[PDB]
């Protein structure tokens, strides 16, 4: 909704337990918006369900609905 | 909508619980998945994918 | 044995490895047309025809 | 009775035997087929389909 | 007696239909069984052509 | 374009040391993937990703 | 081709002396990776990369 960042975004998806990965890997929203399943696997998001939630989450966030 | 473990039981697919647990597939995720995506997570039998897809769409509609 | 009795009743018991590997049960089969049967490797029109008509007759009341 | 290969031979359509064998078209299957279904398995001439359809009908007199 | 279909066609002034008849494997035996709907299905689009064929084949064979 | 203004345009000024020590010019960066960037000590995927996009954007 | 003119074409004329001391001919350079060029004192990734690419072009 109101002026986004990664911490908030992960909390809105129930994925706050990936904050460490995101922090170490310096994944901002601009970066995350360019990433698919392969790339998220490269940074250690092993669960398909987590990758899916992220991928759809960031499209939703930036897409205007 | 409901519990993933109970949904699998209601379809006779309790033996997929381990894949669903490892891939963190909740019901809302499953609702977005077709045959290609289910294949990606290791559901290799057509008949299993078909029951999941048809069972999750009966659950929401 | 329901699916394998069913295939026997049609003379299509040699399809039983495809059906076993793909875990096709009668409820799945009852929803399949030509395209979906081609997707699982039932390549012959005649087999597909017999399967579709057989399951309709089985569940249709006679 | 009579089987599919003798049947095709009797109509002068023996060159179709390989289609009928690839598609496992027995006489009981051919009996349910119209022009559209025969086009689908690659019988492209109307004349050939017409001979098959009238032939199989004759055969259940 | 029955003749080469290209001759039957030439006898009705319809030689230009021979490509359709060859492709569709239409013999006189088959043509004898066809009406307007069936000849439309093989691409004889003009009523006047179908009419000549249907009568032509009655004249030729029925007689 | 030069190295200093490239890194600043991506928010990666803090990398200038690594690029200086390793004598990474833009011609060289252009040929580097994730593995090669890992080799020079750029450990964050996010940074490598920005470097790789940035330099590809630069040579259209 | 001569080693002096090779380093001129890559802008690495300041390595002339490491190459002279270590007797690195182009036939030897062809065999060398990153590990091996580090062993003879070429500390910068970018210089190693240029040498590797340059020789493997010829």
Curated annotation (Swiss-Prot), chain G:
Domain SAM: 2-58
Tissue specificity remark: Ubiquitous; highest levels in testis.
Subcellular location: Cytoplasm; Golgi apparatus membrane; Cytoplasm, Cytoskeleton, Microtubule organizing center, Centrosome; Nucleus, Nuclear pore complex
The record's account of how the chain is modified after translation: Phosphorylated on serine residues by MAPK kinases upon insulin stimulation. Phosphorylated during mitosis. Ubiquitinated by RNF146 when auto-poly-ADP-ribosylated, leading to its degradation. Deubiquitinated by USP25; leading to stabilization.
Disulfide linkage: none
Subunit annotation: Oligomerizes and associates with TNKS2. Interacts with the cytoplasmic domain of LNPEP/Otase in SLC2A4/GLUT4-vesicles. Binds to the N-terminus of telomeric TERF1 via the ANK repeats. Found in a complex with POT1; TERF1 and TINF2. Interacts with AXIN1. Interacts with AXIN2. Interacts with BLZF1 and CASC3. Interacts with NUMA1.
General function of this protein: Poly-ADP-ribosyltransferase involved in various processes such as Wnt signaling pathway, telomere length and vesicle trafficking. Acts as an activator of the Wnt signaling pathway by mediating poly-ADP-ribosylation (PARsylation) of AXIN1 and AXIN2, 2 key components of the beta-catenin destruction complex: poly-ADP-ribosylated target proteins are recognized by RNF146, which mediates their ubiquitination and subsequent degradation. Also mediates PARsylation of BLZF1 and CASC3, followed by recruitment of RNF146 and subsequent ubiquitination.
Sequence similarity: Belongs to the ARTD/PARP family.
Protein name from the UniProt record: Poly [ADP-ribose] polymerase tankyrase-1
Naturally occurring in which organism (per UniProt): Homo sapiens
Name of the gene this protein is made from: TNKS
């Amino acid at each position: 909704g109101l002026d986004m960042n990664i911490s908030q975004f992960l909390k809105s998806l129930g994925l706050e337990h990936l904050r460490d990965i995101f922090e170490t890997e310096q994944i901002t929203l601009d970066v995350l918006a360019d990433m698919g399943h392969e790339e998220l696997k490269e940074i250690g998001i092993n669960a398909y369900g987590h990758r899916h939630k992220l991928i759809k989450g960031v499209e939703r966030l930036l897409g205007g609905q």
